Amino acid sequence: MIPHSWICEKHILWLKDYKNSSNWKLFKECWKQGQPAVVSGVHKKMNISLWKAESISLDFGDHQADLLNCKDSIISNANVKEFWDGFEEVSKRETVVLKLKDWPSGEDFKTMMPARYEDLLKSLPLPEYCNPEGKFNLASHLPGFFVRGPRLCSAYGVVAAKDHDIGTTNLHIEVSDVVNILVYVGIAKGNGILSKAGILKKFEEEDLDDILRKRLKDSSEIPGALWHIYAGKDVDKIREFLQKISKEQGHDPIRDQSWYVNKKLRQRLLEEYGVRTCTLIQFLGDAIVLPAGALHQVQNFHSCIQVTEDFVSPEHLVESFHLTQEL
Ligand code: NA
Domain JmjC, which positions? Predict the structure, then answer.
């Protein structure tokens, strides 16, 4: 048997055993219909010490890069060194929510962080699809022009700012199939920030599936980020909704990646267009697998380091090619 549940109105496949070699057989069935999946425990496969903030900070902290303020997408005054100093120490940062996006990425990730890249390839779940040598992955086989390498993203949590209208990743469409693994969760301290225990209670105030609540009540799990995921089929409805809300407040808002859809807006989106949200908490070691054309947004509660890898399954190639040609 392949241990699993379905989360969020039975829409997301939770594959509960990262060591099960047959995970792909169950995944094949749900993927066919564009359903997301999450595989938990991938951090036990990884050399997780390699992915700690202290380590990543030291290795690649010499490279200068732009830091984004997540509230307004204005590029910050902070340098990379200041970003990492503030990752878990709030007083070194109302403080702002910073993101260090796609640094490094692609060939630079492979070459500048070779041991992490090797660890990644070794640890990717559902390797039949997500690994470059997987039999259902077309990524390394297609001509160049069909396709849009790994990306690292690090960002503070929104808790210190006390502003859960901030997205650390704004609502946007993904162009290829993607797997996102939460590889580090940093508990921030000082400046009156809510503690680890209070942050758990804030996760508990979210509208969650019971299966998610059980995990949240498991003291060995470490929750990091809040995800909202939408079907690609609903994109035109969501675009209209955001154009409407925009007009009420005084143009393609999905292409702009300019919106975090907060609690009140998600509820109105459901009422006024019937568009449903999948809610997920991503715990340390969770690999969230999304098909091309799916939309999602992320809100870190704690500081999080995510690694994302692109792949190309047959199931979403047509949709992927179209979206890539469009970009
Ligand atoms: Na490395």
Answer: 113-327
Give distance in angstroms: CA of 305 to centre of ligand 1.
15
Burial of 226 (0-12, 13-18, 19+ CB in 10 A): buried
Q: Is 296 annotated as a binding residue?
A: yes
- Which residues, chain by chain, have CB under 5 Å from ion ligand 1? 113, 115-116
Distance CA 320, CA 316 (A): 6
Structure tokens at 315: 């199931």
The answer on whether 319 is annotated among ligand-binding residues is: no
- Ligand 1 centroid to Cα of residue 113, in Å, is 4
- Residue 306 — φ and ψ, nearest 5°? -115, 140
**Main-chain dihedrals φ then ψ at residue 128, nearest 5 degrees:** -55, -30
Q: Do you know the residue count of the chain?
A: 327
Q: Domain 2-327 belongs to what topology?
A: Jelly Rolls (2.60.120)
Q: Which experimental approach was used here?
A: X-ray
- Four-residue CA torsion sign, 252, 152, 295, 316: positive
